[PDB]
């Protein structure tokens, strides 16, 4: 009995630089929430059909979840660039699974701003697909090495979102769930009812 429901219904969501991964295996898959795709602002499946997942069997299913702005949801797709795809959460070109997002302004925005959700603002290079970086190493913005000391041209690598409920929809927080359906050379443990 797979805990797909708890991934979507989790009270706390991760900041996107520290995106949470939940491996799903050795269980009976309840795909009911994927049939209710009309209730999500984003619901894009790549090489998957929710009505056919019962007939299919998988070795593992990873559920990555985080909060980003609504105007950043478009970056959670194959072949995208931008601050999120580049420095926070990268999907591969060959991605197989679904990207599901919904507005969470009522929960994740605060008057004055919710500075508790962060994204990585600086990084020496782009992430590889599915790479996760939670280091807080001071970023060398000038030509002079920082030696890890925060200050002049040496910046804290992460930035607060400061979500406010009166910001426009594109700047509002959205909770995102990315499901990767993995069928590797092993026995399938995630099957339908």
């Amino acid at each position: 009995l797979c805990p797909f429901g708890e991934v979507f219904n989790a009270t706390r969501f991760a900041s996107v630089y520290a995106w949470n991964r939940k491996r799903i295996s050795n269980c009976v898959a309840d795909y009911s929430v994927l049939y209710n795709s009309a209730s999500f602002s984003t619901f894009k499946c790549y090489g998957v059909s929710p009505t056919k997942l019962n007939d299919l069997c998988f070795t593992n299913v990873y559920a990555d979840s985080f909060v980003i702005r609504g105007d950043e949801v478009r970056q959670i797709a194959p072949g995208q660039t931008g601050k999120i795809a580049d420095y926070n959460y990268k999907l591969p070109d060959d991605f197989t699974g679904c990207v599901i997002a919904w507005n969470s302004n009522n929960l994740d925005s605060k008057v004055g701003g919710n500075y508790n959700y962060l994204y990585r603002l600086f990084r020496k290079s782009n992430l590889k697909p599915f790479e996760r970086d939670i280091s807080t190493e001071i970023y060398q913005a000038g030509s002079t090495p920082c030696n890890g000391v925060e200050g002049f041209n040496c910046y804290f690598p992460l930035q607060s979102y400061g979500f406010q409920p009166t910001n426009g929809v594109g700047y509002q927080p959205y909770r995102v769930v990315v499901l990767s359906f993995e069928l590797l050379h092993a026995p399938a443990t995630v099957c339908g009812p």
């Binding site: 900041s15 500075y115 508790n116 962060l118 603002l121 807080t136 910046y155 804290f156 690598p157 992460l158 930035q159 607060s160």
Partner: peptide, 17 residues
């Protein structure tokens, strides 16, 4: 007093040690 992420928020998220 802190740029990018305020100091209290850095403590709240476990980013100081």
């Amino acid at each position: 007093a802190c740029m990018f992420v305020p100091c209290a928020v850095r403590h709240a998220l476990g980013l100081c040690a």
